[PDB]
Design a protein around this ligand. Sequence first.
Ligand SMILES: [Zn+2]
Ligand SMILES: [Zn+2]
Ligand SMILES: [Zn+2]
Ligand SMILES: [Zn+2]
Ligand SMILES: [Zn+2]
Ligand SMILES: [Zn+2]
Ligand SMILES: [Zn+2]
Ligand SMILES: [Zn+2]
Ligand SMILES: [Zn+2]
Ligand SMILES: [Zn+2]
Ligand SMILES: [Zn+2]
Ligand SMILES: [Zn+2]
Lengths: 162, 162, 162, 162, 162, 162
Amino acid sequence: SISEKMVEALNRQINAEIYSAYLYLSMASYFDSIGLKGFSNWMRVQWQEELMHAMKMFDFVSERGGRVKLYAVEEPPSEWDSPLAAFEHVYEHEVNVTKRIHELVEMAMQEKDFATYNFLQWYVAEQVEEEASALDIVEKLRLIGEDKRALLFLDKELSLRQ
Amino acid sequence: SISEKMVEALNRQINAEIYSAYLYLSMASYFDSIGLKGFSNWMRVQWQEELMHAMKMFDFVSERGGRVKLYAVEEPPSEWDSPLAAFEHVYEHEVNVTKRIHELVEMAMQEKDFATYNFLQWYVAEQVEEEASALDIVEKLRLIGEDKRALLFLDKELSLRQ
Amino acid sequence: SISEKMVEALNRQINAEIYSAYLYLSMASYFDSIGLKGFSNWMRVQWQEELMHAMKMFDFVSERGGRVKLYAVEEPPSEWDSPLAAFEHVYEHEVNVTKRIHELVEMAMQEKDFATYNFLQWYVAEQVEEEASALDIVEKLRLIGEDKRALLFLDKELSLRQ
Amino acid sequence: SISEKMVEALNRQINAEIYSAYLYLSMASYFDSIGLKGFSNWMRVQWQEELMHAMKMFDFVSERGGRVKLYAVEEPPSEWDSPLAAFEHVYEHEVNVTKRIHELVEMAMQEKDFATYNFLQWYVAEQVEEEASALDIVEKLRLIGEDKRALLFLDKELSLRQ
Amino acid sequence: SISEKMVEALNRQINAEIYSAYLYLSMASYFDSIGLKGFSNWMRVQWQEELMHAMKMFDFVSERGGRVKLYAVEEPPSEWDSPLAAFEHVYEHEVNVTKRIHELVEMAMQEKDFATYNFLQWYVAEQVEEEASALDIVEKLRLIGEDKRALLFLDKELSLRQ
Amino acid sequence: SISEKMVEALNRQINAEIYSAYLYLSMASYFDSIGLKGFSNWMRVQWQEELMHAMKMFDFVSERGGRVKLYAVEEPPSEWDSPLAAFEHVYEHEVNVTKRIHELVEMAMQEKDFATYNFLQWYVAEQVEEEASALDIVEKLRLIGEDKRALLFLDKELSLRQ
Ligand SMILES: [Zn+2]
Ligand SMILES: [Zn+2]
Ligand SMILES: [Zn+2]
Ligand SMILES: [Zn+2]
Ligand SMILES: [Zn+2]
Ligand SMILES: [Zn+2]
Ligand SMILES: [Zn+2]
Ligand SMILES: [Zn+2]
Ligand SMILES: [Zn+2]
Ligand SMILES: [Zn+2]
Ligand SMILES: [Zn+2]
Ligand SMILES: [Zn+2]
């Protein structure tokens, strides 16, 4: 029954989801600059999805009678060494988001805030996919190496994402 | 071929459109906090629309051969004295966005960047609608004054925005 | 931001577009009077179209924050020497309408009223069609000459205008 | 009111568009000859597109009251050293096309020929896509280098163009 | 199989078909200059068709393993004394075309190039229609003489061609 | 512009595909002799399919303007120690065919004969299925050993092939 500490922690996480969106938008611009439009498209859809994660939590906080406060969204990095390094960064970033969602879950249960626990279980399950989807692309890119035809094949797969 | 100056200016405007979106999202939280879900709905539509403004320019910059650089999105104000004050802030903000667009249009003309000039005409037209829509709500709020039943009539009208 | 000078000029042009309509309605009566019901139809369609030209500008003036003032609509002439003379007048009239639109365009450019400038571009494009459509009929009526059978063929063709 | 000079210049551009088509049709022959049917298909589409560009300006010139004069279409080159070299020539050719459309735009601004100026804005925008589309393929071929499997992957992509 | 002799002769016929197209494009501008939009429609459809006759041969040469070489397209005549004179010129040009097609047929057969012989039969049959359609309109214009309504009736009939 | 060398290598592979068919027909007669009419059926289906492989390549060489030259089809072996040994011969024969296909593919790429490369990709993918199908059956026959009912069960399953 929503505490100030919970609302603050969720507002910080709204900020981290928007930051996640903006990181991937910056990667969209990186992949565009190196001609990989399929990879770009993947990042743009991820930036759309992260903003939906944020908005789902924005509505939740407000539905619970809490007040959403918005914080600065930081300037994201703009360059990566390669496609592999970008997706390794996606994976480590998402692993980190996972850690934060788990601390939120533990904070909810500590306060016996069952509505927040139940609402967060959606993110727990979405984090499982985020990490697996990023990891699978890291592994493909590791196999691919410098094979250009394979890089383009993957770029076409990623094109299809909606 | 687009100049570095013109790319930097569009990049700063992409940032101003994202901040616009973010201002409106902050307003949405303010309207929720005062029990005006219709006004809040209107702001949430406007936040999606400003992000569309931003992405149209984001795609144009790279289509032109330029590189988008993303900057920090500043923490927006979070309180307004009244619905009327919020919408006066919307109107003044949009008038100043128009000033920024027109300065872009001038800088394109000065550089004979016909491509950018042409592209920006969409924003010139769009700001006419932005300023009018805001101003119409300011004028209704002035006509309404402190009549709260008429405020809630407007609130219902705005909840219909899609 | 839209100047009083630009408003007044748009208001005079609205008057000119309604007078155009009224001039074509008068020609319609003239063509009925000499048994050319197709020519009459063409003028009735043109009267409806000029009114649409006027209303589009009517809506723009308030959208920009100005106020439309409506002025008297002048009594139009009512006889022409021939179908050709009537259509040469149509063509010259439209040529003069174009000159007036291009003058608004210049006044908007001089004021850096980009909004109004962009809006006027539709009228720019539309006068191209207006001049050519009239001129095509003028040219046919010159080719036709005094051949009344050919005149009536043209009358039946114009009766098809929707 | 459309000037002789502006007519000529537009007639010469109609020629340049037809030659563009023809050059692309030559490149389609070349691509067929080295067994790249997708690249050939892309060039056939582009030949049809350039003729549409030409026919748009052909129609405008007579709609403005001018007279199209048709000039000889020059023999295009028939061979390139590589697919990459053909597409570098596409990009350069389109950048040079853009320069001529922009000169047309200034000649229109200079003569206060707003009607032509406005009609040319379509070609301004279309040259943005024409340059980007060609540069994207140039950059792809530079990434592909000598990898013939990757080249054939790009050849299949380009088959899809309609 | 296909000989260099046969390819050269087909490449020159591809040129002649394109020149046919371009000739008919020139006549389109002529008819447009004298206000006959139906006639001009007919000439634009013919230009499209002649280009299709050309592309059909272009694709055949290439399918047979031959190489299409494109040559310059010569500046067509731009003026005729009358509609009748323009259609007599159509009729005579197509008569000459039919003679060259019959010559190609004979060359194929002398060479025992049975694939080319069979392919050109399409053109044999098509030249039958081309000549007859042109001659039908020549005879119609001959009857019409100076009758203005009859000229305008035929013009409308020709406006229906697609 | 398919080379003489490529044509000869393809003719040799037509001969190899016909011999493949003939080998399998001989294995049909063998399986017939030891009473396994499902195994026989599988071999007759394979004989028919290898003949289709051959005829697809016969048609390709001819469609490219090349000339198919047919060579002697050698006498195949007529006896095998057991069903297991027949299917191991099948397996190793197909692995040998795969190796010949990969050499044709590399010749094609060496010559930049992309139409032959692309055609050959059908055989590359078919050879994957051929090896897998034969190996699956080898593996089942090793598990089977001398178990009479398991052999009969596998025989009935091979009966069903069409
Ligand atoms: Zn997220
Ligand atoms: Zn995520
Ligand atoms: Zn905006
Ligand atoms: Zn806005
Ligand atoms: Zn009008
Ligand atoms: Zn008008
Ligand atoms: Zn073009
Ligand atoms: Zn182009
Ligand atoms: Zn023809
Ligand atoms: Zn013909
Ligand atoms: Zn086979
Ligand atoms: Zn096989």
